[PDB]
Paper text:
2-Deoxy-d-ribose-5-phosphate aldolase (DERA) is used in organic synthesis for the enantioselective reaction between acetaldehyde and a broad range of other aldehydes as acceptor molecules. In 2001 the catalytic mechanism was resolved for DERA from Escherichia coli (DERAEC) by Heine et al.: the active K167 forms a Schiff base with the donor molecule, while K201 functions to reduce the pKa of K167 and, together with D102, participates in a proton-relay system critical for efficient catalysis. However, practical application of DERA in organic synthesis is limited by its poor stability towards high acetaldehyde concentrations. Hence, a monomeric variant of the enzyme (K58E-Y96W) was used that has virtually identical biochemical properties.
Residue numbers in the entry: 3 to 250
The structure:
Amino acid sequence: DLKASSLRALKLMDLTTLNDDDTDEKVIALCHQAKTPVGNTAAICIYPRFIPIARETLKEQGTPEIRIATVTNFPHGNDDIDIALAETRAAIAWGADEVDVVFPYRALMAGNEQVGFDLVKACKEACAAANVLLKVIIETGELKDEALIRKASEISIKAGADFIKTSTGKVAVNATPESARIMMEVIRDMGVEKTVGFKPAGGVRTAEDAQKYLAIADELFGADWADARHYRFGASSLLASLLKALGH
């Protein structure tokens, strides 16, 4: 049970460091940690200014295909499209393979559904031109309400999200199995399972946690569905828990 789930989950990790005071040394160490005795993580996720040093570290350890994700409009999810789009354009220029943008969830909570569509769509158009995948963080722990989680997910998908993602990791409540079920049901109901991935992020701590999230995916979409284009774990400490479950 835990061995099989843990080796799947490890391969799906966006191994992340997003601190206010990160350093090159910490990002280098993270890149080294992404190359494990049982597999490489799918990606690393770091702030944009670290993309060049991460790319060279990944090449120099012989893992050039570990993707580099970053974040924009982050963590706030403010509703200023010009800023979100400028930050997304800058992340592309820094060399990102993927951008995880924060949806304007407080504007949605205040009744504005259109700004979330326009913000995601603008960011998607910049990313798509550069062959960069766009994940959209809806911040389920602050939306709280099931109807709002569904609505933010639907808007994001309609606007072109390549993934929908639970959380920034910067608020009090991040991924939960409840939130994951709701978001994956939207992917199912909208018929976009082929084109939209899911990423639970923040507070995914243990191999046991990861096994729960994969069980939801397998139930909704079949055991074949999850893969790097369709599923990621936004996590850090989880990696050591997965390796421990695997005997490392």
